[PDB]
Structure formats: C-alpha cells, structure tokens
Design an enzyme around this catalytic site. Structure first.
Site, PDB file in Angstrom:
ATOM      1  N   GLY A 167       0.638  -1.148   0.015  1.00 23.83           N
ATOM      2  CA  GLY A 167       0.068   0.014  -0.120  1.00 23.83           C
ATOM      3  C   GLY A 167       0.942   1.431  -0.047  1.00 23.83           C
ATOM      4  CE1 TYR A 174      -6.514   1.758  -0.559  1.00 24.50           C
ATOM      5  CE2 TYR A 174      -7.764   1.223   1.340  1.00 24.50           C
ATOM      6  CZ  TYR A 174      -6.367   1.612   0.822  1.00 24.50           C
ATOM      7  OH  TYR A 174      -5.287   1.664   1.469  1.00 24.50           O
ATOM      8  CG  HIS A 185      -5.202   8.574   7.783  1.00 29.12           C
ATOM      9  ND1 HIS A 185      -6.310   8.853   7.151  1.00 29.12           N
ATOM     10  CD2 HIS A 185      -4.167   8.121   6.716  1.00 29.12           C
ATOM     11  CE1 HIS A 185      -6.436   8.411   5.890  1.00 29.12           C
ATOM     12  NE2 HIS A 185      -5.292   8.013   5.595  1.00 29.12           N
ATOM     13  CD  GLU A 187      -1.536   8.752   3.187  1.00 28.42           C
ATOM     14  OE1 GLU A 187      -1.365   7.511   3.037  1.00 28.42           O
ATOM     15  OE2 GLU A 187      -2.816   9.237   3.277  1.00 28.42           O
ATOM     16  CG  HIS A 273      -6.291  12.467   4.329  1.00 31.21           C
ATOM     17  ND1 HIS A 273      -4.830  12.821   4.383  1.00 31.21           N
ATOM     18  CD2 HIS A 273      -6.482  11.287   3.493  1.00 31.21           C
ATOM     19  CE1 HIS A 273      -4.338  11.788   4.077  1.00 31.21           C
ATOM     20  NE2 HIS A 273      -5.185  10.902   3.673  1.00 31.21           N
ATOM     21  CB  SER A 285      -4.664   4.794  -2.993  1.00 27.55           C
ATOM     22  OG  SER A 285      -4.573   4.047  -1.693  1.00 27.55           O
TER      23      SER A 285
HETATM   24 NI    NI Z   1      -4.740   8.691   3.417  1.00 23.30          NI
END
Ligand code: NI
Ligand SMILES: [Zn+2]
Length: 351
Positions: A167, A174, A185, A187, A273, A285
C-alpha cells in the site's frame, strides 16, 4: 512569497492537458507552485482522452481476501471505528451485498443531505469495506499517472533495500459501499498519497491544512486522552472519526471535496484527511514522495505502541539529498524547522 499562494489553504482542482499529464512528478511540483499543498489535499481531473483501463467487467471474480466490517462507536461528533474482519469474498459477492436493500445508498437531493445522513447513521448498520486489496486495475502499458509505477524518489526504498511495504510503495485497491469510512490520518512517514476512483459512487473527503495539523492533534488528544497516553501517534491507528461540526466547534480549519469516478486525489505530507464512500465503488491508491517530503519523513512522529507499523529508514534519503546535514542529523543535532507553505524544490523549473 509562497505565503501568498493559496492564502486560504483551500482544496484546489486541476484540469491538466495531456502534455501536462505525462510527467507525474513535474505536475505535482506544478500544483505545489500554485499552493495546492497548503490545503493538504488536491483534486486532479485527468484529460478525458485518458483511461487507465479499457473495461472493468472481468473483476467480479477478483478475490477480496480480507473484507472489513466497520463498527463505529461514539456520539456528538466523536467516534472510534473498530474493524471486524469477515471471511474472504469475491467482488460480485461484495457488490451484491453493497447494493442490497440493507446496505445501499439512501435517496437525497443536495450533497449536504447525504453528508448529514452519514454523520447521523455512522454507528448503525455496520458496512463492509473491501479494503487493502493488493493489486492494480491499470492496463500494463498505461504510462501516465500509473499508481503501480510513478517513479518518484520513494522508489529509493525498494531500490536500496529490496523492501516492499504493501500500500505504500505498492498499490492497494479499495472496494467501498455506502457509509464505509476512512478515519482521520496522515500517511505513513507523512508521505504523499495518490487516490484514483476507478468506478462507482463518489468518495467524499475532509482535509485539514498541514500548517494547522498540530491543532487537530491537540484537539484529538483532548478528546481521547487514554489513547493519547498509550501512543505517541494514536491517529495513525486510523480508528478516529471526527465530524466537521466538531471541527468547526473547536475552530479547526478544514475543507471538504467530493471525488467522482475517473478523478484523482492527491494528499500532501502531513495533510490530515478523512471521509466516506457514497456507495459501491472501487479505488486504487499508493504513497509517493518528493524531495520536500524528506524533511517530513525525518520528523514524522510514529505509532509507538505496535510492532506492526510502517517505518521507513530515512538514512538513504538524507545521504543522497541532504549530504551536508547527514553528520548533523545522525548526531541528533539537525534542528531544521519545516515550513508547510513552501513548494517542493523541483518546482524551481516553474516558479
Ligand atoms: Ni490517506
Ligand atoms: Zn500506536
């Protein structure tokens, strides 16, 4: 000077030409020259001439090894989300459950209505999220914004050490349904992320400007003192949901945006975000880096309570890109202060 670009730190939207679209890192540096990063989040609408895949019809047989049922507990704008892993299932199976009467989207007029319903029914009828599925839906030959191979300096991790982090320097897929959520959170290692919504109902996002990130953390610590006491970075557990009315109530600056099928989202280092899916959809992603990220990487405050958490060795980035600081940094005497408003250096080509 950059202080004067996107002074409101508002979420910006870009419509690059195909010539602009071809060099990923270049266009990222560009949108930063325009102050997009100050928002922590930016939408990029690719040229209509472009498509990552010809068709999404062979994927009903794709297996979701680890579906997650999202139980949410809380009240008054504050929630903690627990994951209940369900047994594996194929996409068509997921889709069937997603569009079922129990789990499908409610009827609504304006977005403000669907949003209000999300925050009212968050804790009811726990949905299933087809999360963290290893793989890509890109066609092998697509060379523009291919999440599987964006060629940023994050590639230095696998290149130097052979390490892959699922990831992070590999793609995740997803599968969402209505009312499935992603908690507040930033990244891992406070990297960038890229998110492409392949198909289906929209995904809505909230974002807090990096320059106000610390204020969100202070609020979150106050509202969850036990978790704060137990972990230096409990938001990284991605279990904490906070409604926009609560943020407003406590004077945390934020913006919102809805991501449509065929659209990209970019999140920036230390951009908090969160959000939710409108209905059945599929998103891809991964993380990526720029030179600007390196300082964020060096200073990221990491989860201190789990063996299983992502930690990238910064050594190689500091040696190659901050050679004059390496001795200082290794000696714990590098006191560089981050300016969230400055664009990445690669934008010198523009600015
Ligand atoms: Ni994120
Ligand atoms: Zn932790």
């Amino acid at each position: 000077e950059s202080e004067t670009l996107n002074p409101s730190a508002r979420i910006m939207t870009f419509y690059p030409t195909m010539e602009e679209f071809r060099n990923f890192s270049r266009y990222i540096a560009y949108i930063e020259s325009q102050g997009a990063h100050r928002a922590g989040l930016a939408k990029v609408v690719p040229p209509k001439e472009w498509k990552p895949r010809a068709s999404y019809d062979d994927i009903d047989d794709l297996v979701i090894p680890a579906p997650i049922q999202q139980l949410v507990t809380g009240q008054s704008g504050l929630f903690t989300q627990y994951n209940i892993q369900k047994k594996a299932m194929t996409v068509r199976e997921f889709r069937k459950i997603a569009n079922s009467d129990k789990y499908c989207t409610p009827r609504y007029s304006e977005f403000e209505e669907l949003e209000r319903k999300y925050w009212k029914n968050l804790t009811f009828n726990p949905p299933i999220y087809g999360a963290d599925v290893n793989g890509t839906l890109y066609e092998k030959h697509v060379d523009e914004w291919n999440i599987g191979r964006l060629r940023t300096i994050l590639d230095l991790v696998e290149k130097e050490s052979g390490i892959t982090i699922e990831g992070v320097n590999t793609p995740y897929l997803y599968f969402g349904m209505w009312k499935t959520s992603f908690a507040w959170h930033t990244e891992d290692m406070d990297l960038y992320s890229i998110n492409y919504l392949h198909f289906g109902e929209p995904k809505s996002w909230y974002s807090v400007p990096p320059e106000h990130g610390k204020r969100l953390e202070r609020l979150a610590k106050g509202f969850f003192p036990g978790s704060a006491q137990s972990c230096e970075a409990f938001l990284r557990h991605k279990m904490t949901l906070i409604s926009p009315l609560m943020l407003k109530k406590y004077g945390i600056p934020f913006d919102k945006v809805t991501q449509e099928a065929g659209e990209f989202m970019i999140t920036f280092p230390y951009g908090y975000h969160a959000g939710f899916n409108h209905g059945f959809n599929c998103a891809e992603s991964t993380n990526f880096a720029t030179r600007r990220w390196i300082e964020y990487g060096k200073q990221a405050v990491l989860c201190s309570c789990r063996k299983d958490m992502v930690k990238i060795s910064m050594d190689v980035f500091v040696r190659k890109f901050q050679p004059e600081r390496y001795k200082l940094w290794k000696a714990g005497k590098d006191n560089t202060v981050i300016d969230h408003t400055l664009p990445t250096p690669e934008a010198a080509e523009f600015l």
